[PDB]
Design a protein around this ligand. Structure first.
Ligand code: W8N
Length: 130
């Protein structure tokens, strides 16, 4: 839709602070911090697939909107995820150990903008079409 495509990371703000708030250790933060992943979003019927690809780590999720699923995150958290579409924004929540984090993906001009919140920290990552 507005989201379908192959996207390349072009900027990132506050990602180290976001990872630190999630409890990610130094070695993993170091690897994640200067990663420049591609994000590949596709849809077939009810099922949306988001692939995130980078030199040292790939992940993939597939989901139906509104249906909770189990996810292993790139930093190895075992979480329960739910993704919904609200005002054209894809809103993902991950829940684990009584904590949560939200990841909002939105389309703005030429940008896929991804806002990640954990407690007081807000990270913004911008992707452009590859
Ligand atoms: C392999 C890999 C998997 C996920 C991420 C993210 O950064 C995910 C979040 C936090 C959701 C942010 C985003 O999608 O840009 C990075 C890499 Br490298």
């Amino acid at each position: 839709d507005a989201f379908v495509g192959t996207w390349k990371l072009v900027s990132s703000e506050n990602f180290d602070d976001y990872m630190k708030e999630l409890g990610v250790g130094f070695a993993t933060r170091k690897m994640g911090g200067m990663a420049k992943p591609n994000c590949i979003i596709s849809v077939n019927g009810d099922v949306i697939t988001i692939k995130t690809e980078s030199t040292l780590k790939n992940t993939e999720i597939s989901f139906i909107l509104g249906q909770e699923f189990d996810e292993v995150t790139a930093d190895d958290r075992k979480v329960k995820s739910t993704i919904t579409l609200d005002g054209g924004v894809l809103v993902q929540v991950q829940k684990w150990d009584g904590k949560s984090t939200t990841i909002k993906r939105k389309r703005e001009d030429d940008k896929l903008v991804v806002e990640c919140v954990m407690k007081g920290v807000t990270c913004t990552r911008v992707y452009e079409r590859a």
